[PDB]
Nucleic acid binder design. Structure first.
Ligand SMILES: [Zn+2]
Ligand SMILES: [Zn+2]
Ligand SMILES: [Zn+2]
Ligand SMILES: [Zn+2]
Lengths: 90, 78, 94, 104, 97, 253, 90, 87, 104, 96
DNA sequence: AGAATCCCGGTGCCGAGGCCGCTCAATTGGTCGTAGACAGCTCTAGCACCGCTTAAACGCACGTACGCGCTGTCCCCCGCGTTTTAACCGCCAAGGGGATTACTCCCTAGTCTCCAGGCACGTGTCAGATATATACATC
DNA sequence: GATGTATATATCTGACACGTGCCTGGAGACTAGGGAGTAATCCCCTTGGCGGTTAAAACGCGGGGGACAGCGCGTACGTGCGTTTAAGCGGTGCTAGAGCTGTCTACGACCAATTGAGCGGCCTCGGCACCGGGATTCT
């Protein structure tokens, strides 16, 4: 019963769901492999974080469809791979 | 270092997407997917920055990086 | 100044003539600025491509009609074109 | 009087003219080109704002916020086809739960 | 007929002509049996008038419409039949007394 | 009576043509759509503004949107002149141009009074109906069961209470007798598919009365009024039809 | 038997839809925009090639969806899912 | 004007064997009998989108013939690129 | 000499230059622009043809056919990303049967 | 009465022989390669044009083309394309 | 032993591979303008740091809604053979639209002059966010 | 009955609606020139219809593999609880580089003049398609 309460509560909101600081750390750890001594505008990090969450949320919406298609409720590694492949090749 | 994206953080994203149940194995896969996405966007964003001979990645560089991948953002001045 | 100009002043005017009871938050305005520039580029983009595809150098209202019908889905184009032709007609007569 | 005034438009026809020329979309831009375009840009702006307005009323608000712009886009199928590749900042998602996940 | 009635009878007759005035071109000279309308600008067509708006479009107006935007309005079909029926009914009553 | 009925009927027919699903009078604010029939701006916008998802056209099987609609223009012009003709009509024949459409101008009463007046001239397609006598918002009807039903040959009596916003919002449809059916309450309340998310001005007294017998033909156990019956229909289906038939023979009315 | 058929159809480069009935379909649709509209014979070929490529790509995705559901036979439901993820009708 | 237009259910020109072969190329082992109806539906919509644009380009050029170039541009507009018919 | 000769390229540096200006991509085109571009077009062309040629040899053919151009692409991850959205006329498909469809 | 389209078919032949001296290419296959060249050309010219606007420049130079390639080509394909590009320009510029 | 995938040798089809002759577009060299490269300075917005705050995340134990595999029964799909349709080849003619030239003159580019519509900035109201107490609608 | 969601209010902390003064792009009015608009020629190639051959689609039947509906078992999550964890907030202080301004010069648009690398069509073989028979899969 809780999952349904949470789905409604989160869909009604707009805030970013990933904690901002640890997200920024991830960005920096990736960025260093392209160029050293890079700096980021604080708004740039937000832009990137927002794009990232939007990507994953959309992916989860499609993944969920794949899961119910298979007549299951729980999201499996198999379901994300399928949804990702069909989308990935478009 | 990718562990910065906590299990609850993933769950929250999944809930917004309308997921009722999550297999515990998805968290490791999800992080993998995210890692790849960011690598692709950042690679492009850095390239734009280098082109302009700047050492700062601006919001506009992230936006352009995303426009090229078919994911346009609004609200960042692009 | 060198800071890029936006359409926030025009978005206000449009809203007031449509839904006068409400205002626009600054973040919402930012979204609208991207929207206008996004659509602007798409239409201008197609108008450019058409000029090349049809071996022409000048863009006129005719090329734009084509560009709009190609970009706007469903019935949206029908209304958009109507407004376009009316504006041109009035402009021409003025 | 301005071109926008003559055309009965709110959008800056004079600016559109400049943008089309500077943007190098073509070697030349016709007199009726920016007029027609401004009308289209204004029309689409009006469509999205009208819907955003109604969204504000639904939430008993008198000010448009990013969420309202997205709810307007997402509920209208036509706009979804046009802006299906666009993410609105702080737009969240359009509420939706599939029947298979609900109580019986 | 009485001073107020006879005025009204003449009005109703004139009104019919004004109702029909709505369907006109250089050739749509009268009320049409099978009028074709174009969405977005009206400009109702004769029975052999729509063929030209299909080929080229409206004269001067030239609305860039598809051939799917052209159709006969059923509401006109019915209203038109009634306006003809009324014309005759009004005239006969005026003649009779 | 110098052929005044014929003049009256042709003029009244003009109004009949230019009349929406809600209004039973000449449309004063007409708008055109993709399909061939005119609606009021106010009436159609209210329908489209309901949270029912995409709406279907009340006068045909096609759909409707706020977009694609345009000033009826020609028809707006017809309305103005037709009103001027009515002015003359009162002097030409001196007759009414409405079937007792003299109720309250808000439409709350005029609409229900006018529909009942028309009902008397043109009753429901497959049944009889008229007023109860308590108010103009309380109607009765007698309906016989269609062949494609466990209720075949049975006859039920209705007592329907209409709201002031009828037919924009659904009426309180009720039977005076309890019927063994998933959608029928022991207190007589009836839950039709058409009385909730599918309710619209599209539905007239004839259509509503027909819909009730249609539901008897094919019950809907999803969110029932009487779960104690709905469970049987949903699971066994045939068991329900047999019991309903036996019940009908004694309690149909 | 079907497996041999798959190998042969994947290997060949031939058009799988008969040319004449395809051209008829194109005209049947095209006439709804303009009357008396002509086509270059090459234009129809180009369209048919794109058309077959489109459907084959869709079938490849459809097949994967059915496999995911632990089925071999593809259903209309699987086509709809593939289109829903691709975003053709969403 | 003067067009002997033919209005028919020409979608039926795409028969079971044709769809079956396409599905086989896609690696499908078994096909439900309901697929044939669904597939035709999908194809029609796809073609409508491509043709609509190809015609639109032709109209712009004030031509009465849809050329290979117009089909190719239409496909690019739809986000799909075809090689071998254009230049 | 020619410009392509000086660069040591097979592609027409001179025509690349003309296209950059004719296509109105920018108000001005730098002298080193068409040379660099020509080199890239050549490189990519060589990569596809080399692989297509290899496909032809495997099938015991001497002349390249559209199917070989496509197979070379389908068998190359770098090219699948580059030309993933491209359809090659009469290319057919890359052979593929899933294990779940086979006898056990 | 002159062609206004031209093609790269003559250059494709030359490149083909350098890689596979004993092979040939059909006219249909040539149509594919010709289109390919124009497709890539447009993509590179397209990104270079966008870079000019995004960086407030009115001239496309070898720098923009280089960047455009890094954006358009994946992985190691880009790595080689850039190398071939810089080599051709260096030789050309020094005229050696 | 049966039926479908290749190979081997042979003729012949028509595709492409090389060369003739011509001329648009490539190449060269010179003039002048300015857009870009560079140097040089201000002070904006970002980096790293500290300490306190408290909502978020970690880890654990209970027990049960779901996932997984197995059995059994239904039907509707695939393979086969036979009949019927109309897909396709090759041929014929008419004739409608495409691509081409050659002249016209109307529309847009570029030039300066001069002005008020939008920009940055600051002031003062007030619209939404948080938290409390109010009663119902769910679970 | 026992929790949790919308209701109406007080409070107040930033952000929005408006107004002021500046100047930078807009509009006004004129010349020059070249883009595309019209008329008129004539050459493909599109449409339509003719028949005949015969490959592909359509019908009906056999019967068997896969779909899927129900059963029962096991455990991988979901729910709550309690204990730390570092994420978020505010404030401080340093300084690297983003952006503004001004100067000067490689180098790019543009023109006119020379000429040859590729275009377009024709002559000559040689790589594939496909016939007809054989052996190797391969079920
Ligand atoms: Zn007419
Ligand atoms: Zn018109
Ligand atoms: Zn009404
Ligand atoms: Zn309708």
């Amino acid at each position: 019963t809780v999952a349904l309460r949470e789905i409604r509560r989160y869909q009604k909101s707009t805030e970013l769901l990933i904690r901002k600081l640890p997200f920024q750390r991830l960005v920096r750890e990736i960025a260093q492999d392209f160029k050293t001594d890079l700096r980021f505008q604080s708004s740039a990090v937000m832009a990137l974080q927002e794009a990232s969450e939007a990507y994953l949320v959309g992916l989860f919406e499609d993944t969920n469809l794949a899961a119910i298609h298979a007549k299951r409720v729980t999201i499996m590694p198999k379901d994300i791979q399928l949804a990702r492949r069909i989308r990935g090749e478009r | 270092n990718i562990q910065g994206i906590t299990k609850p953080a993933i769950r929250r994203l999944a809930r917004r997407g309308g997921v009722k149940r999550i297999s515990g194995l998805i968290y490791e896969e999800t992080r993998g997917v995210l890692k790849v996405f960011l690598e692709n966007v950042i690679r492009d964003a850095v390239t734009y920055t280098e082109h302009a001979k700047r050492k700062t990645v601006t919001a506009m560089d992230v936006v352009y990086a995303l426009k090229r991948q078919g994911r346009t953002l609004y609200g960042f001045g692009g | 100044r060198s800071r890029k100009e936006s359409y926030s002043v025009y978005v206000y005017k449009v809203l007031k003539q449509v839904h006068p009871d409400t205002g626009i938050s600054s973040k919402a305005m930012g979204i609208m600025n991207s929207f206008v520039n996004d659509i602007f580029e798409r239409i201008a983009g197609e108008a450019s491509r058409l000029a090349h595809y049809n071996k022409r150098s000048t863009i006129t209202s005719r090329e734009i009609q084509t560009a709009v019908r190609l970009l706007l889905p469903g019935e949206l184009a029908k209304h958009a074109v109507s407004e376009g032709t009316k504006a041109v007609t009035k402009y021409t007569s003025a | 009087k301005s071109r926008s005034s003559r055309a009965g438009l709110q959008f800056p026809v004079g600016r559109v003219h400049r943008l089309l020329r500077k943007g190098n979309y073509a070697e030349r831009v016709g007199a009726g080109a920016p007029v027609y375009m401004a009308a289209v840009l204004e029309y689409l702006t009006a469509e999205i704002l009208e819907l955003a307005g109604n969204a504000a009323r639904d939430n008993k608000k008198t000010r448009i916020i990013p969420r309202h712009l997205q709810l307007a886009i997402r509920n209208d199928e036509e706009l979804n086809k046009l802006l299906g590749k666009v993410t609105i900042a702080q737009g969240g998602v359009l509420p939706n739960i599939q029947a298979v996940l609900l109580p019986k | 007929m009485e001073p107020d009635g006879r005025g009204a009878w003449a009005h109703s007759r004139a009104a019919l002509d004004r109702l029909e005035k709505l369907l006109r071109c250089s050739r749509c000279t009268n009320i049409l049996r099978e009028p074709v309308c174009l969405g977005g600008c009206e400009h109702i067509f004769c029975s052999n008038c729509v063929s030209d708006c299909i080929g080229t479009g409206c004269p001067v107006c030239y609305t860039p419409a598809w051939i799917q935007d052209l159709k006969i309005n059923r509401q006109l079909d019915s209203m038109i039949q009634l306006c003809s029926k009324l014309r005759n009914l009004l005239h006969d009553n005026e003649l009779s007394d | 009576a110098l052929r005044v009925e014929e003049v009256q009927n042709v003029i009244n027919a003009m109004q009949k043509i230019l009349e929406c699903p809600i209004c039973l009078e000449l449309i004063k604010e007409p708008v055109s759509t993709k399909c061939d029939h005119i609606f009021c701006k106010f009436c159609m916008l209210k329908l489209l503004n309901q949270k029912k998802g995409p709406s279907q056209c009340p006068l045909c099987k096609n759909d409707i949107t706020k977009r694609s609609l345009q000033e009826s223009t020609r028809f707006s012009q017809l309305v103005e002149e037709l009103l001027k003709i009515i002015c003359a009509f009162q002097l030409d024949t001196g007759l009414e141009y409405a079937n007792s459409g003299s109720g309250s101008g808000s439409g709350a009463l005029k609409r229900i009074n006018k529909e009942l007046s028309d009902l008397a001239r043109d009753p429901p397609a497959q049944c009889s109906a008229g007023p109860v006598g308590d108010d103009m918002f309380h109607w009765q009807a007698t309906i016989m069961g269609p062949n494609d039903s466990p209720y075949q040959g049975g006859v039920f009596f209705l007592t329907i209470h209409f709201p002031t916003d009828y037919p924009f919002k659904p009426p309180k449809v009720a039977f005076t007798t309890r019927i063994y059916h998933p959608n029928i309450n022991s207190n007589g309340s009836i839950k039709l598919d058409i009385l909730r998310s599918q309710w619209s001005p599209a539905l007239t007294i004839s259509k509503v009365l027909l819909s009730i017998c249609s539901l008897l033909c094919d019950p809907n156990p999803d969110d029932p009024l009487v779960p104690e019956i709905a469970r049987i229909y949903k699971t066994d289906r045939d068991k329900y039809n047999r019991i309903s038939r036996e019940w009908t023979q004694k309690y149909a009315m």
